[PDB]
Amino acid sequence: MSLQGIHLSDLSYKHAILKESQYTIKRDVGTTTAVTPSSLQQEITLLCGEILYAKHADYKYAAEIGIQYISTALGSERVQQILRNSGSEVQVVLTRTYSLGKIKNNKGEDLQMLDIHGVEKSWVEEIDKEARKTMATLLKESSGNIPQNQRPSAPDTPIILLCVGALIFTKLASTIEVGLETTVRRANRVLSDALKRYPRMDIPKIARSFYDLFEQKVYHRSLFIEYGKALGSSSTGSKAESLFVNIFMQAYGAGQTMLRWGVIARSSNNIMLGHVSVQAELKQVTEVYDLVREMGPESGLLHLRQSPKAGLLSLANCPNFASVVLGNASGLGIIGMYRGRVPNTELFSAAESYAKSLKESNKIN
Amino acid sequence: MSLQGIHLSDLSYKHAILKESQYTIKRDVGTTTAVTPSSLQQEITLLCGEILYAKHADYKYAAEIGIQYISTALGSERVQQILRNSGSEVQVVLTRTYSLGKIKNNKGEDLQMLDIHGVEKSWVEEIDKEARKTMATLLKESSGNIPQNQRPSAPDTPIILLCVGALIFTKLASTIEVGLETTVRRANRVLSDALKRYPRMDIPKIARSFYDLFEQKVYHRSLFIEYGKALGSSSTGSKAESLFVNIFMQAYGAGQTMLRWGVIARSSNNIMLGHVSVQAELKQVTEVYDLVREMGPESGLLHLRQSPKAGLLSLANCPNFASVVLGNASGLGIIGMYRGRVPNTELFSAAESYAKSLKESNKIN
Amino acid sequence: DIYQLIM
Amino acid sequence: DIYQLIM
RNA sequence: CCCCCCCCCCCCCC
């Protein structure tokens, strides 16, 4: 009689399969990583500040120093707990201060330098000596012209480093070249005050270091996210911290621009959504959006965390809906240089024509 | 006075017969299988990378090495529990590291190699020796030109092997020839970064090994499935793990493409669904879909698990609905080379004509 | 010199 | 006196 | 008896 019982609900079933698992995976059984006790927070800020105000030969572990500052902020045992809950069996190693040698400091004690697991001491020593030589040259050239906010010991230098890190984080679903170019361009504006304070922070090299660290140590991504979550939950903060949370929130829906652009296509009243090919797929489209609603707030972080569950949110099996959505994005000028493939060129062209006509014209409702 | 009480509900009754059984079945009572303790993950990773970067005369046990990695990722005791819950009495055996002999490694210790149950040690020795010879030749050709990502010790090489295995897993309701062709064709594209890093992994032979393993050791299918379940539930992961989960979801509705194609034919509004011969069968069609809803998310894995309960999901007793569904799929051009039988040729032809007419024309709702 | 490769 | 800077 | 096709994902701007 009626074709009413013909219904499948496959995507809900796939998410039920993935979500309801009673065995946890074990990765990185014999590996180790470094954290810093919060007591050393000052001594890491200085490090984060010495990467910034001098031109360095190598920037391999700048991202690691930012992660070390995050470790001081959250706490070493909390970072152990975060990494453990991320699904990785990495064993934390604790940062230790060691005497450099016969070198003496201004306070009369031995010069204590940080010792970070996985970061060779030669790199830290050379960064420290290079920054010290740079400050010596600046003091020799100009006397009394160095304020506090132009020094490596400024409290927000770790946050500036991590702001470059958050810029590169926003483009973790893109490629390295596009990510680096976007980071440099957006850092020239977003981090303009910091760049004016530190005119020789190598943003491209720091950003490349952050991309390398995010690719090598995926669990650190989760650590990064926790910092953002722990930062947006603070009662007060600095302007650099608010900027970091702004970039971190801009990273949210990364790797799912088709869902947002489909919402935009619906909002624009694109009549090519009424095409029969799109109607034949609106059921699975709504099912993907229902999956988003079911996953909840953590669904946006799926691609940033590089969760294997990501891909259930893909709208790639609705080629006509995707073509109409991309056409509507192109007609509004939104698409930019988005490289997502367009299956149906006719629907793309029709949607672009309607979107151009709608945007160019004006109406009163 | 009315024909309202005439009803049987036979398929639900058959499902309640098969499901509500107080007696479990015992199989594989005298048999044994191999697992590797998670603490040897590193040692198995190397092996999973040494089948990848050399050209081997024999690829018999590659699937076994992938299962060994799955065992290390899940845990030997948890894998024993999984194999017990699949309904098998196979006695797990534990992998043992043994010294090769007088041969010593770079660190000055005895070279420890894995000893897997059921795998001849000679096979492991020849795989390791061929891989070592291949890398020696490659370093003779070029000095210092081998990054980490082209080495067997890369952490994702077991995942690459298991992705070839998952490609062969997607085609487990097909035949061996079609499955092998599909795996090679899809692996040339999907596993392209791996094939660039490892230019001499014999995908056909590894795929045949995985097909064999899934034939003799059916319980390992369950193990495979658990890995996917355990892998899509992780907060983070590698790119290769996301690829594995993507193929594993692509394997979901395997063996039940007529249900999906009937949902399509309903979404395609094929008018020949309204033919009286099909109308006489929509009630049992609806019962089949009701059975899918009753089984729930585990209904998609019925054919992958090779459950005897599979076949209750068959629409083969509704020949006219099957003919109309196949005709609608053929008209839309999605039937491909599907070899399902078409009982009613006239309904097939009419449905295909209507679906072609619908696809060619464009309408706006 | 085959068994001391770094891998 | 490079190491006696205030930083 | 059943089954049988095809297909990673991502990618803009702020």
Numbering used by the authors:
A (entry chain A), B (entry chain C): 1 to 365
C (entry chain D), D (entry chain B): 10 to 16
Copied sentences from the primary study:
The viral genome is encapsidated in a sheath of oligomerized copies of the nucleoprotein N, forming a ribonucleoprotein complex termed nucleocapsid. The nucleocapsid is the template for transcription and replication by L, which is also dependent on the obligate polymerase cofactor, the phosphoprotein P, together forming the active L/P holoenzyme. In oligomerized and RNA-bound N (N-RNA) the nucleic acid is threaded along an extended groove in between the NTDs and CTDs of laterally connected N protomers. An important function of the C-terminal domain of P in nsNSVs is to bind to assembled N-RNA, forming an N-RNA/P complex.
In the reconstructions, additional density was visible at the periphery of the NTD of N. To facilitate easier model building and to obtain improved maps, we carried out symmetry expansion and local refinement of a dimer of N-RNA/P as before with N-RNA. The final resolution was at 2.9 Å and comparison of the N-RNA and N-RNA/P dimer maps revealed a density of sufficient quality to allow refinement of a model of the bound PCT. The locally refined cryo-EM map resolved the residues 288 to 294 of the PCT bound to N-RNA. PCT is wedged in between a helix of N (N residues 121-141, helix αI2, RSV numbering) on one side and an extended loop of a beta-hairpin of N (NβHL, N residues 99-112) on the other, burying a total area of ~1100 Å2 upon complex formation. We observed a noticeable increase in ordered density of NβHL upon P-binding, compared to the apo form (black arrow). We observe that the P peptide wraps around a central arginine at position R132 belonging to helix αI2.P hooks onto this arginine by packing the hydrophobic surfaces of PCT side-chains P-M294, P-L292, P-I289, and P-Y290 against the aliphatic chain of R132, thereby completely surrounding it. R132 is additionally stabilized and kept in position through a polar contact with D128. Moreover, the face of the aromatic ring of P-Y290 packs against three hydrophobic residues located within NβHL: L100, I103, and L111.
